[PDB]
Symmetry: C4
Subunit: 93 residues, 4 copies
């Protein structure tokens, strides 16, 4: 319960950092900087864009390292203790 809330806020602040960086350093639109931030951390990736400034490239490097860990954690638990009991509850005869 209080672990989803935590790993949620840490993901919010993580995504906030990226949206400000890319919307500032790389010149993306806020919504675009958010998307890029989301697709890189979940490792989906963006097919239409890549960081054009060496600054953006180095940030993205450290960003991926500090991020892939905590972003997927929220993906695991967002299901494990949230999406799961919700789907178990629909099965029960």
């Amino acid at each position: 319960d209080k672990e989803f809330q935590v790993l949620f806020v840490l993901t919010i602040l993580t995504l906030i950092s990226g949206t400000i960086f890319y919307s500032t350093v790389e010149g993306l639109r806020p919504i675009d900087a958010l998307y890029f931030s989301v697709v890189t951390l979940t490792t989906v990736g963006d097919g239409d864009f890549s960081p054009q400034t060496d600054f953006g490239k180095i940030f993205t490097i450290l960003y991926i390292f500090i991020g892939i860990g905590l972003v997927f954690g929220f993906i695991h638990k967002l299901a494990v203790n949230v999406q799961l009991p919700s789907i178990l509850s629909n099965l029960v005869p």
Copy 2:
């Protein structure tokens, strides 16, 4: 047995939601909307396309979150209790 069937139907409805959204909001061909839906959730990604409407971008965001969890689950078990005993059965002398 009845867990593969479940995580299968939840993946069907998940993929259905995406195919309708992208084929409607982003204007992709049904088969294309399906592909995009599949490559984003398995995190492979699409190199030829990215959501062009801010609507599609936000949907994809929430879509990736609610999806990467249950899609890989079907990938894990589709093997664990299906692909595996099938390959163990071919080894037995």
Copy 3:
């Protein structure tokens, strides 16, 4: 020991199927069809290309499902019981 060899041959036959399909249906060069096959299953993805025939798109769909499971398994164990004792052996004082 005999588990790396197995998950290795299953990955060989998996990669072989893809290289023939893409080099035939999509018209890629053998080496290119192999690369695409490798980057899609490890979920890295290809930024320069996507299946252009609906046949290639549907194959890739089923291909990703039957594949991401067994390809990463070889990635896990290729390290766990191969890359690891090799690196533990270099540490020992």
Copy 4:
């Protein structure tokens, strides 16, 4: 403690090998070769570029195999025993 340092240096040497290969064989700028090396191993991928020489393609193949294992290991533990106690320490009332 001494396991983060290890999996860190193995990732440094891994990333070094790639940066030299791509900056030499594919003709990327050092910083670009590094980025590509990072995005392929974490499976994020690059949307703006793909290996253009068959040499680069085959290297990338073996590179992804020997790499995805040890790179994510550093991602797991970089959090587990580093990012985690750091975040647990901020919660304590």
